[PDB]
Structure 1
């Protein structure tokens, strides 16, 4: 249980981040959500976190590709919550192309969100955690923070960068009651992945589900998707006392991807 804890989840209007916010709320944490989407859906998300799980929930819109907006977001989040115990740096994007064709603006956008926002969010959060002598920073990296695939230069670079940044954060705050770890998922069937399944299905002239199977077969030995719920469970474990001395490391939920 995380009763009383104050959590922030970036990019929690969709996908993995939405499940993170849900699982933390179900554990008893008040939650700040963030991200893009339809305003009606976002407000329904916010209000149902409160009405289902009896916590406080706030939505703060911030484009975390902007450094100052990210730092201002963390301040506003901590003000809303009355503190900041758990930060989940989750927001991210993907774009696929070979390096020589990879758009410079897409490189910049992926580095800005998937890497730099993790730095800026961490930097803003840390003094709050340091003052109280407790904190969790949970970075959502990827299997692609540990290994590579073709046509994902920016994303692999960014995610490797997140794994490095995680280690530094941990070392700088070792023994302070603050841990920092990176959750490294394999394939999870969110909109980020559905776009790649569709692109495969076209390339190969197959139906969407045959394409999903081929995507899994190439990388993920279990031949099953990792679920957002599972990953929310992992974040809840990282937030627990059992994980007091788990810091600076990666937690891979990837169906065997990185074992081979």
Structure 2
């Protein structure tokens, strides 16, 4: 279980992020939700999770495309929750186009959220985790952080960047009770034959369970690595 621990999950108002926040809440961890969406429905989700799992759940709608906002998300999480044991950098966007047709605006946006937000969030969380003597940074990369697909240059570059950044985070925190790993999902229903051998989608629940495992003490020495949840995508 994760009772007494605080988890911040970026982009948890829906999809994979919500699945991960839900799984962590079920383990007894207090949660800080984040992401865009309908204010009224987000409040329903927040209140629902808190009541269903008997944990404290807050919502911070910080726009993670801005570095100071990402750092602020972490700062306020610590101020209101008292600490930050788990940081799940999940928020992300995408865009398909040939490299020569790829809008610079889209390239910049994808790198800002999919990669730089991981840097800013990690930077703000580390001082706390080092002092606490405990930390779990779980970055949601992609199979595209390990291999590529045509027409997804910005996304693949950003995700590969996340994988590298994860490794550095791990090396800088090695032995300090902190681990940093990157979950690399294949397709999630948030087509299969071309990339996913199992011909089965990965689910937010499975990814939540994977995050829960990485947050456990059994994973104390799992650091600076990738955990592929892709139905065989990267095996071939």
State TM-score, norm by structure 1: 0.90
Question: Are 2:215 and 1:243 equivalent residues in the alignment?
Answer: no
User: What is the match of residue 231 of structure 2?
Assistant: 255
SS in 2 for 1:189: coil
SS in 1 for 2:84: coil
Shift of 1:41: 1.1
User: What is the match of residue 49 of structure 1?
Assistant: 49
Mapping for residues 1-260 of structure 1, pairs under 5 Å: 1-190=1-190, 215-260=191-236
In the alignment, the residues of structure 2 paired with residue 188 and residue 253 of structure 1 have an alpha-carbon distance, to the nearest angstrom, of 10
In the alignment, the residues of structure 2 paired with residue 129 and residue 92 of structure 1 have an alpha-carbon distance, to the nearest angstrom, of 24
Shift of 1:4: 1.1
Please report the RMSD computed on the Cα atoms of aligned residues, expressed in angstroms: 0.4
In the alignment, the residues of structure 2 paired with residue 80 and residue 146 of structure 1 have an alpha-carbon distance, to the nearest angstrom, of 36
SS in 2 for 1:156: helix
In the alignment, the residues of structure 2 paired with residue 41 and residue 188 of structure 1 have an alpha-carbon distance, to the nearest angstrom, of 22
State TM-score, norm by structure 2: 0.99
What are the Cα deviations for residues 196-233 of structure 1, in whole angstroms up to 9, with x where unaligned?
Answer: xxxxxxxxxxxxxxxxxxx1000000000000000000
SS in 1 for 2:88: strand
Shift of 1:180: 0.1
In the alignment, the residues of structure 1 paired with residue 78 and residue 35 of structure 2 have an alpha-carbon distance, to the nearest angstrom, of 17
What are the Cα deviations for residues 112-157 of structure 1, in whole angstroms up to 9, with x where unaligned?
Answer: 0000000000000000000011000000000000000010000000
Q: How many residues align?
A: 236
SS in 1 for 2:182: strand
Larger Rg: 1
In the alignment, the residues of structure 1 paired with residue 142 and residue 59 of structure 2 have an alpha-carbon distance, to the nearest angstrom, of 25
Shift of 1:89: 0.2
Structure 2 gaps, min length 5: none
Runs of at least 4 residues off by over 6 Å:
none
In the alignment, the residues of structure 2 paired with residue 76 and residue 61 of structure 1 have an alpha-carbon distance, to the nearest angstrom, of 12
